[PDB]
Amino acid sequence: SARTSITRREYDEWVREAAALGKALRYPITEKMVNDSAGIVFGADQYDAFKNGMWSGEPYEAMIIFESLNEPAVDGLPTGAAPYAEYSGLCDKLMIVHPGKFCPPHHHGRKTESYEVVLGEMEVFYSPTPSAESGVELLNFSGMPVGSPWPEGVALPKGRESSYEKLTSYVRLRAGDPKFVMHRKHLHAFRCPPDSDVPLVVREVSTYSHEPTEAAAGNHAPIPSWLGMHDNDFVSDAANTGRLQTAIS
Amino acid sequence: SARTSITRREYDEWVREAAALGKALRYPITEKMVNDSAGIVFGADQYDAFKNGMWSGEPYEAMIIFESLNEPAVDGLPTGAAPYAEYSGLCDKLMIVHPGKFCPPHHHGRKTESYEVVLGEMEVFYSPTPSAESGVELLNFSGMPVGSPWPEGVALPKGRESSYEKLTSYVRLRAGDPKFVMHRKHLHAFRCPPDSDVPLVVREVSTYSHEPTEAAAGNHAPIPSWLGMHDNDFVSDAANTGRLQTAIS
Amino acid sequence: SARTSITRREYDEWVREAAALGKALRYPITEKMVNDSAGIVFGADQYDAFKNGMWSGEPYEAMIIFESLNEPAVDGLPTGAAPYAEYSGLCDKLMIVHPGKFCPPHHHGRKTESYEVVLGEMEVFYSPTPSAESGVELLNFSGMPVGSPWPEGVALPKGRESSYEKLTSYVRLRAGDPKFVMHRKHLHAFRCPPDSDVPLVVREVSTYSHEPTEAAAGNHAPIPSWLGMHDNDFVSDAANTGRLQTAIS
Amino acid sequence: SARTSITRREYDEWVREAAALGKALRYPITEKMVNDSAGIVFGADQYDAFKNGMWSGEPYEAMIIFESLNEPAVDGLPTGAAPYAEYSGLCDKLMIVHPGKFCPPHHHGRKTESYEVVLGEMEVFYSPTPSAESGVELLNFSGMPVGSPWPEGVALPKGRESSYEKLTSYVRLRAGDPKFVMHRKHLHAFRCPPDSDVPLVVREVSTYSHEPTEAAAGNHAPIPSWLGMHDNDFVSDAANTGRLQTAIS
Ligand SMILES: OC[C@@H](O)[C@@H](O)[C@@H](O)CO
Ligand SMILES: OC[C@@H](O)[C@@H](O)[C@@H](O)CO
Ligand SMILES: OC[C@@H](O)[C@@H](O)[C@@H](O)CO
Ligand SMILES: OC[C@@H](O)[C@@H](O)[C@@H](O)CO
Ligand SMILES: OC[C@@H](O)[C@@H](O)[C@@H](O)CO
Ligand SMILES: OC[C@@H](O)[C@@H](O)[C@@H](O)CO
Ligand SMILES: OC[C@@H](O)[C@@H](O)[C@@H](O)CO
Ligand SMILES: OC[C@@H](O)[C@@H](O)[C@@H](O)CO
Ligand SMILES: [Co+2]
Ligand SMILES: [Co+2]
Ligand SMILES: [Co+2]
Ligand SMILES: [Co+2]
Known part of the structure; x- marks a missing residue:
């Protein structure tokens, strides 16, 4: 079922x-x-x-x-x-x-x-800490703040628990808080608390999103290399696939 | 006076x-x-x-x-x-x-x-059209839309009229409209209609703002060259100066 | 089914x-x-x-x-x-x-x-026009505006069409419009246009609501008569019943 | 001055x-x-x-x-x-x-x-407690809650301090709180905290406002008695006068 x-x-x-x-x-x-x-x-x-x-x-x-x-x-x-x-x-x-x-x-x-x-x-x-990219020197300026440990009792998806292992830093953001920066090459995930009376609504302002998705499959490439270029690396392999398409029956 | x-x-x-x-x-x-x-x-x-x-x-x-x-x-x-x-x-x-x-x-x-x-x-x-930068080739992808001519009766600041001469393209944006892109190297200006019952409030999402202003004079430079780097070029010289500081008596 | x-x-x-x-x-x-x-x-x-x-x-x-x-x-x-x-x-x-x-x-x-x-x-x-209440004189001051005729193509609920017959006056209200008064004793109904991209959300400010509903069955009566008093008169009998309770399986 | x-x-x-x-x-x-x-x-x-x-x-x-x-x-x-x-x-x-x-x-x-x-x-x-109206019996149902004592350090207007003496009950309301009822015949006043970063904005829903003000001097009276009828009783006499008109030079 x-x-x-x-x-x-x-x-x-x-x-x-x-x-x-x-x-x-x-x-x-x-x-x-x-x-x-x-x-x-x-x-x-x-x-x-x-x-x-x-x-x-x-x-x-x-x-x-x-x-x-x-x-x-x-x-x-x-x-x-x-x-x-x-x-x-x-x-x-x-x-x-x-x-x-x-x-x-x-x-x-x-x-x-x-x-x-x-x-x-x-x-x-x-x-x-960012993910080390073999054979390439990377610039550094502010890095990411250490944050706090996870609060207790965070229910993770069944069969996806281990994908969260390395995301040990935690922070709870609210409306009105300073903008929060998630530098590239940093593992991240986020959820809406289960006891929330409203859906979590977040405005994301980032650099270009390279995603050959369903609603973005057929456009023009501003630069040759950008064509087909993927920039999403999910810890769980099951996540990478279903990301680019939703099965609607 | x-x-x-x-x-x-x-x-x-x-x-x-x-x-x-x-x-x-x-x-x-x-x-x-x-x-x-x-x-x-x-x-x-x-x-x-x-x-x-x-x-x-x-x-x-x-x-x-x-x-x-x-x-x-x-x-x-x-x-x-x-x-x-x-x-x-x-x-x-x-x-x-x-x-x-x-x-x-x-x-x-x-x-x-x-x-x-x-x-x-x-x-x-x-x-x-962008401003031509002598001795350097520039990339191109979408360019800027031609837009429409100016509507009639636009009151410009006294002694600043000519600074608007080259900004011949015009567009009126409203809440709910598609995001509007102003590519770098393009002359631009904007105003709130004089008959508006409310102030114009606009959310700007852009690339880094290089401005050695008053509230930004003493920070750390992520990259050497960025230090002191200016990225504002006002058509009117009177505008460039007072931009970095407000005289409050 | x-x-x-x-x-x-x-x-x-x-x-x-x-x-x-x-x-x-x-x-x-x-x-x-x-x-x-x-x-x-x-x-x-x-x-x-x-x-x-x-x-x-x-x-x-x-x-x-x-x-x-x-x-x-x-x-x-x-x-x-x-x-x-x-x-x-x-x-x-x-x-x-x-x-x-x-x-x-x-x-x-x-x-x-x-x-x-x-x-x-x-x-x-x-x-x-208000509904005439037999054997009682009623005060009058502003009455209700005539409004406009119904626009064409208004789909009514199957088996409820005739309940709308007498509601010949029509008006389309939007955010920012003057507050709209619906005097007591006046037949009224309203809908959200079928082509709306959002649900119709309306703030109603009225006099006391006499309704011995499900969420209001057990409180105290400020005045004796108010007890059990009903103040809803739906044109369709099917509507009056299901109003005071929703069948949730 | x-x-x-x-x-x-x-x-x-x-x-x-x-x-x-x-x-x-x-x-x-x-x-x-x-x-x-x-x-x-x-x-x-x-x-x-x-x-x-x-x-x-x-x-x-x-x-x-x-x-x-x-x-x-x-x-x-x-x-x-x-x-x-x-x-x-x-x-x-x-x-x-x-x-x-x-x-x-x-x-x-x-x-x-x-x-x-x-x-x-x-x-x-x-x-x-409501103000007793000599020679007339009044209905009662919920009355007003006792509330809390005033917090310390409330700066009152110079020369208006004593007008607040009897308003001993206090409550601080915020967005999202249950609607707050101020029954007729009850002395009341309210302010925006002095340290607020924003003006206090409150939506009031009340019964008819009888005020022969400046913007309401010339309309039609729904009921004879309503004509000229005043329903504002300020503790300070200086307040009752300037209420119906603002001196704009
Ligand atoms: O103002 C800084 C902000 O609260 C966060 O610590 C950073 O954006 C994290 O990158
Ligand atoms: O699928 C997630 C999407 O790409 C979002 O814009 C961000 O990465 C979430 O961090
Ligand atoms: O959707 C495109 C938008 O309306 C504007 O034409 C462009 O952002 C202009 O650069
Ligand atoms: O002084 C203007 C400021 O720098 C703004 O962010 C944009 O340039 C306006 O186009
Ligand atoms: O300002 C009056 C308003 O537009 C409506 O015509 C009335 O409230 C109808 O009762
Ligand atoms: O069931 C409708 C409810 O009682 C509403 O408050 C108004 O009457 C709608 O006109
Ligand atoms: O829900 C009741 C509310 O919080 C206030 O106690 C009353 O309206 C006061 O009259
Ligand atoms: O002048 C105050 C005005 O009449 C307000 O609507 C309420 O009384 C304030 O309690
Ligand atoms: Co991401
Ligand atoms: Co600009
Ligand atoms: Co109704
Ligand atoms: Co009052």
């Missing part, structure tokens, strides 16, 4: 309600942003989130993302910056995570993120 | 009211963001904006900016990207422009911006 | 999501307000709204109401006003109507309402 | 900024609501609030009120209720109080109020 997809009704009610919530919070959500790629389920065994639904409070890895901007920022750059442009760009999106649900452990080789909680509270789990 | 500064009372009422407006619109404004550098007057002859005040509707070049993020995004970058990092980074700020007032004509060599109107309407004036 | 109740999952996702939307729009929703009486289905044949769900856009009579205040306002009144107190009082609630759905035709003998659209648009159908 | 009026510039910047704040918080403010009666100064010696301004934090009695509704609710009432209609009606308004400022001690013979804090925090001072 393990779900393997989400019904069209479950998908729409989930995504359309989320888009309305976004508008209420003044996020500029256009029609094109409300599509079949906005609702994400990280892996086949994560569809079980829809057995009891998004308000069950159960630990599953799924979320909604409404992307309002993913600008390469390639125009006006000196030609020499061509091979390093992929680390820049501007990506603005609204992320909605229901109680107990998670944006699973992963890291980006090029994308640096920043978080602004709009509604609810965000519990971020991360590795304070 | 030409004003040469702004009284402490005029400054505070202007900036503190704006910060409250920002909070109401859910922008994460912290205490440190509400400072003596947030309220900007572009040039000595622009202080006359305070003869009749911010609700007079008169054409002057002055605005408020509450910066919530100006992240270099240098961490995790390969060393080779060092000389091109200045074109990246993440800068999030809230800008408040009162009726009739303007963010004066200028362009950035490195910073690419994007606009999201939160309240009111934004009238953007810009040059659809 | 005609639904006869709503599953606990359908109920919670419907009501809890609505409460979150309410909070985002700054309505003061407390825990006690989010209960099993907030989600209303007007009649047994209206449960079919949940065959395709609240985002189907189909015409059904169901809505959500989060009541933040229902103050008798009896304290401090001269004893003589006792028999007329039932026409006063203060009731503040947030109403959420999904696309295509309706608050069915009905009128109140004592309650006068006022509407403020917070999100979406509200299409009100009403009778510009 | 004691101010005796408010300049047109001080008035407009105060009221127009407040109206913008109101809109941001989604209060339906129309053009007609933004008038010369919205900004209130309670007495000649209260104009000194404008010596240092609304952000000085100093204790003065002045506030802004944007009334969106003041419905008699007389239509549909049985003729017998005519002499008691004045205790009913529906009045919806947004009140804005700057740091340290107060809505001065007063009570209403007919109007019962309810408070909903939208922004900031509201400190209410009141008398838990």
